[model samples]
Target chain A: GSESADLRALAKHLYDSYIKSFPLTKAKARAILTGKKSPFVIYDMNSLMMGEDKISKEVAIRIFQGCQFRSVEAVQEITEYAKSIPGFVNLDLNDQVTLLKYGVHEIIYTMLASLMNKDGVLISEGQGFMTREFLKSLRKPFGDFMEPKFEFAVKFNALELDDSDLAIFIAVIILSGDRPGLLNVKPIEDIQDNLLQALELQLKLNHPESSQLFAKLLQKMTDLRQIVTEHVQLLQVIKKTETDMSLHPLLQEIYK
Target chain B: GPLGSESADLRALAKHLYDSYIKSFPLTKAKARAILTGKKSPFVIYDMNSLMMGEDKIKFKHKEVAIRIFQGCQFRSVEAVQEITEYAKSIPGFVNLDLNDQVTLLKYGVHEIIYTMLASLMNKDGVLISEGQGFMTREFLKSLRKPFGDFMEPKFEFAVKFNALELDDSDLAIFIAVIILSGDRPGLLNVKPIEDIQDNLLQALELQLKLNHPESSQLFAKLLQKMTDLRQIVTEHVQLLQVIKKTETDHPLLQEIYKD
Candidate 1:
C-alpha cells in the first residue's frame, strides 16, 4: 500500500511538470486542426501541394523546417499576448522572432510538432503548403542548419536537394530577407553573396507553368521581409535614444 | 446464566467497540463494526499520512475478517445491502452544500450512523490514497454453506487504472502480472490461458495488498492517481469553457457532451 501510494505521488509530480510545458496545447491544437475557431490556426490553401512528391527535396526540406509557424490558435495566442504589451505590439517581425526565440515558445512549438509527426522530418522545411509536425519521425542530423536569423548555407546545401528544393528555399529566404524588420544583423550586411545569388536563380529560371503561384508566394514573402527590415530600423532608433539618454546625466552634471 | 445476560454482554461489547471506533478515529474518516458474535474490533477510516501520525490504537491480532454477514439478519433484505453499497459510494464525494448546511446535516445522528454502517460494509482491504473522513470496520467472521453461499464481507478499493510505469515497485507488480497475462514471460504464473490470467490478476492484487501493509497504502495510491486524472480533466474543461466564452462557440468535445 505504501509503495503504490508513493508511486502515484511521484507520478503526479511528473504530470505537474508535463502540464507546464504541454498542458492544454495539444487539446487546443486538436480543436484548430478540426476547424475550431482557435485564433492560432494559420491556414494556407497551397499547403496541400507540399512534401517529397510535389516539391523537390530542398524546397520541401527547407520551408518545412524553417520559416513556418504551427496552428493559427498558437499564432493568435502569441500575437494577442504580444499586442497586449505596448513595446511588443509595435515590434517588427525580426524582433518578434527574437522575442519568441528568447521566451522559448518555439521549442515547445517544435516539440508538439515532433510528437504529432507522421514522418521523421524535423519541421524546419516549408515552401508552398505544409503544416508543422508531419506524422513521421523527426530528422535530428540536420541540426546544424537550425541557425538563428539566417538559415545555415553549408548545412542547407549539404542536404540532398534538387533544383526545385533549392528554388523553394531561395524563395523563402528572399521573401524573409525583403521584410524591413529588426535583426541582430542586416540581411545584406550579414548573409553571403552566394545565398543572395541563389534567390536570383528563381527569377531567372521562373517556371512558366507555375509562374502565377510563384509570383503570389514571392510577393507575400517580399512583403514579410520588408516589414522585418522596417522593424529592425525602428529598433536602431530606440537604441540610439537610450544611448542619448545615458549621456544626458553627464551633460547635466557638467553644465550645472 | 440466562440468555438475557448473554444479550446484555453483547450489547456492552458493542458499545465499547463503538466508543473506540469514534474516539481514536482517523483524520477525515468515521467507521465502526460490531458483531453480535466474534471479538474482532471495529476499524476506523484513516488516510495514508495518518499512519505516520501514529493513530492506529487497536491491538486485535487477527487479520481483518475475510467475510462478515449478519445472518437471519436484521439487515437481511438483499435490496437493503445494495442500497447500502450505493450510499457508501456517495459518502466520500459529497459537495455543493454550504458549511452550515453540511454541519446541520451532520447534527442529526441518523446520517452519521448510516455513514458508519456503509463504511463498515465497504471495508475489505485497500490503501488510503487521500485525506478521507471515512472508516471501515469488521465485527465478525462467519462461515456459511459453500455452494452459492451468501458473501457477507464487502470490500471497496478506489477505482484505479494501470498505466505501465515500471520504476514504481507496486506498479511493476501489476505490469509483471499484465505481461504474464499476455504471455510475455515464462514463469510459474503461466498466464496463457484465461483462467491462468485471472489467477495471475488475483495474485497481483494480493501482492498489491501486501505492499499496503500497516494500512491500506496501495489502495490509497491507486485512489490518488484516479483523483488526479479526474482533476486534470476537469481543469482542462474549465479552460476550454473560458476559450468558448471568448469565441462564442463551444469546443468540439464540449459540443458532443452537450449533445449526449
Candidate 2:
C-alpha cells in the first residue's frame, strides 16, 4: 500500500508534466505553421501545368518535397518526446531508427488530429487553417495524398480526447514494441505496460462515473493502428507514381 | 526533491484526498467478498438468458428485478461521479477554468476515470460489477453470448493486468487528479491555464515519489508506460460498445453514453 501511494504520486507527477508538454493545439499549431514557412522549394501548380493541365515530374517533385518537409517536422517532434523516455536514448541507434521509421508517420497523423476539428487541420505551413473542402480540392495526387490522414483526424477528433490524453497516447504509439528488428523488445514492452497502467489509473481518477470510458479509449488505438496501416499503403502508391521525385533521404530511410 | 519543508503539507493533502475517496465509496474488499459469497446484497443479478427472453416468456417480476438492479447501478455510479466532481472542485486551480472548459474536461474524461476506479474492483478471476449483487465471475461472463458478454471482457483483462502493478490509495488520489486536469480534450478555448495547474501537480507528485520509492529507480518511468496500457484497454472497450450499438436498442443509459 505504501508503494502504491508512492507510485500513484509518481504517476500523477508524470501525467501532470505530460499534460503541460502537450503536442499540438489548433492555435499553437497554427502559430508554428505560420511562423515557419515550409522550405519545400518548388513552383506553383498553375504555372507549371498551364497549357497541358496534366501531372508532371516537377509537380510530383514538389509534392514529395512538401511531404518531406512536414514529415521531418513530425519526426522531430516525436523524437523530442521519445528522447525524454527513460530507456529510449540508451537503445542502439539502429533500433531507434527502425522504431522511428515505423512509428513516425503514425505519430504525425496523431498530432495532426490535435490541429484538426470538423473543418480540417490548420495548415499553417502555407495557407492558414486549410478547410477539409480546400484540401480535398488540390490537383492530382496532392489532394489524394492527405485524404487518408485527414480521414483519420476527423474520426480521432470525434473521440474528444484532451491534450494531456493525446500527449501520452502519442508517446505510447511511438515507443511501440512491434517495430521490425528491435533489439530491446523487453524494455520497450515493459515501458509500454507501465504507461498503460498509469493511464488507466489516471482515467479512473478523472472520470469516476463513466465505466466504459477506459475501454473506449483503448478501442481508439485499434482505429488509429488500422488508419495508419491504410495510410502507409497510400504512401506506397504515391511513391510509385512520383518516380522522378527525389524523396528526402530521411523520408526514404523512414519508408524503407 | 526528497520530502522537505513542504513534504508534510503535500503528504497531508494526498492523505486527505485518499481518505475522502475511501469515505465516499466505503466499498472495501472484505465487504465486497461478504456480499458476493453469501450475504444478501441490496442489488440484483440476472441470468443473461432470462433477462433477454421474448416479452411473452419473461415475467413482470423478472422485468422489475432487472430494472431495479440496473437503476441501482446507475444511482451508485452517479453518486461516484458527483463525489469525483467535488474532488475536482477541491483541487486548487481546477475550478478556476472557464465553465465551458471545465465541463468539456469532465464530459470527455468521465469514462476513462470511471474505468480506473473499476480496476480496483477487479481481480484476475472476475470483477465486482455493482456494489451489491452483480459480481459475475470472468468465466461465467465469457460463457454468455453477444454484447452483454463481450462488453466487459476487455475491461476484465485490463483490470487483471493493472492489478498486477499494485498502486495504493494515496497514489490513486494524485493520479485521479491528473486525469481531471488533462489539457488535450477537443474544443478547449484555452489550455495554458489547465496545463499550468497540471505542471504544479506533476512537480508535487514527482517529488513525493522520489522520496517514497527511493528503492526503485525506474518507478516513475514504469508508471508512465502503464498509461499506454490504459489506452489500449479503453480502445477495446469502445470497440465493444460500437458492436453493441449496431443491433441492440435496449438500455437508454448505455446508448446515451456509448453512442457514436
Candidate 3:
C-alpha cells in the first residue's frame, strides 16, 4: 500500500546523505569559490582571442588543451562526490572506477548548469565570466564545440534547479547500471533505480507546477550524451588533424 | 535489480545515439508528419534550413548532390559511418570493449544498422522518403546510372520486410545496440564480455517486445530471423562497396570500413 511512503523515505535518506556532503549554504559556496584560484587561464586566453586574429596552430592547440586540461581537475572532486552519494561506495573498487569512468563526463556537463547562466559559464573558480558571444568566436572546431554546451546550459538553466535537487539528479547519472563492462550489475542498478525514483519524487515535491520537469531532466541526460557523442567526433578530428596534443594522463584513463 | 530497467534506461541513453544524430532525423520526422496530417504522400523535400544548408547537416550539389540533401544523412555513406561509430561509443559496454573489437563491430555492423534504420525513412511499397517530404520512388534508385546504384535495392527490399515488424524508434534503438554489440562480430578479442552484455540486452529486447506486443507469440523469433537476413545483406553490401571502391575514392573511410 505504501510504495509511496517507502519512496518518500528513500528519497529523504538519499538527499540527506547528499546534502550533508554538499550543502548549498552561503558558507559552503564561499569555501568552494575561494579555493586558491587556479584561475581558469583559458578564460583569459578566450578574452585575448576575442574576435579573430586568425589563431596560430599553437593557439588552437592551446585552446583544445586548455579545455581538456581544465576538465581534469574537476574529476578529482567529481570522484569524491560520487563516493558521497548513497550506496556509491558500496560497490567494488572496479565498479566504482567504472561508474566514474562512464558517467564522469556526463556529470561534468550536468554540473555546468550551476556554474552557468544563459549568458555564459563562470570560469577561474567563479572569478571570470566568458560571454557566449566571446566563447563562440574561437573559430572552426573550437566554436562548434562550445555550440552545444551553450544550447544545453541555456535550456538547462531554465529548469532553475536548486542545488538540493541537483544533489539527487547528478547521482542518477553516476548510478547508471546500464554502462557496459560491469561485473556487478544489479548492485549498481539497485542504487540507480533508487536515485531515479528519489529524484523523480524530489522533482514532484519541489517543482510540482511543471509536470514534465522530471522528464525534461531525464531527456537532458540523453542530450548531454549526444553533445558528448558529437564532442568525441569533434575531438577525433581534432586529434587526427593536429600533430602534437593529448589529454592529460588522468583524462586518458577514462577517455578511452 | 529490476527485470528490464537497464534497457529502459538504456533506450533513453541509446535512442538518440541509435537514430540519426546530425546525420539522420529529418525524413523520419518529415514523412511521419505528412503521414499523420493527411496520410499524404508528397513528402516535404527540404525544410527552409535543410534546403539552405551547404555541407553541414545535410548535403546538396551534383554527383547526386540532391540525393544527400534531401537525404538528411551525410554527403555520402561516410557520415553514416561516423554516426554509427558515434552510436557505438554510446553503448555502455562498447567503449570498454577491446579496441580492435570495436572497429570490427562497426566495420561489419555499420550497414546492418544503416539499413535497419532505413525502414524509418521508407514505406513498404518501395517508396523511399527523401528528407521526410519528396519521394525518390522505386525505379528512381534503379536508374542511378551507376554500377553501385544496384547496391541499394537489396537494402530497400530488406527495409520493406523489416518495416513490417513495426518496431518503433525505441525498438530500433535497442536493436542497434544488439547489432553492434553482437557476439558473433568477427575479430572479437573477448567474446565473453560482448556476449554477456548482448545477453542482458537480448533479455531487455525480449521483455520490451513482449510488453509492447503482447498479442504476438512469435515476434521475438521473427525479429531474430531478421538479424540473420541482415547478415547476408551486409555481405552483399560489402561486395558492392568493393565493386565501387575501384571507381570511388572520395569516400575513403568506407574503404577502411569494409576493406578492399
* Model 3, docking class: incorrect
Give the runs in model 2 whose Cα sits over 4 Å from its true position. Answer: A1-44, A47-256, B1-3, B6-9, B28-79, B132-134, B250-260
Which candidate model has the greater lDDT, 2 or 3?
3
Task: Encode model 3's per-residue lDDT on A151-228: one tens digit a residue.
Answer: 787777777786767777778788876577888987886676666667767788989886446645664665666666
- Model 1 C-alpha lDDT per residue in residues B89-126, reported as the tens digit of each score: 23222123333333333322222133222333343433
Q: Kindly report the fnat of each predicted structure, to 2 decimals.
A: 0.00, 0.00, 0.00
- Candidate 2: tens digits of C-alpha lDDT, residues B48-126: 5533442224222314433343344445556667767777777777888999999888876666777777777766666
RMSD of 2: 11.2
DockQ (C-alpha based) per candidate is 0.01, 0.07, 0.01
Off by over 4 Å in 1: A1-14, A33-60, A63-256, B1-260
Please tell me which predicted candidate would have the highest lDDT against the true structure. 3
Docking class of 2: incorrect
Tell me the tens digit of each residue's lDDT in model 3 across B1-260.
79967667745554454454424434452445346344535543233333334243323332354344323333335556776787677667788987888888888787787787776766644444434435444455555556645756787788777876777766666777777887555567887798667765665666667777777543554575467667668767766656655665544663354342
* lDDT scores in order: 0.31, 0.61, 0.64
Position B22, candidate 3: lDDT: 27
How does residue B43 of candidate 2 score in lDDT? 28
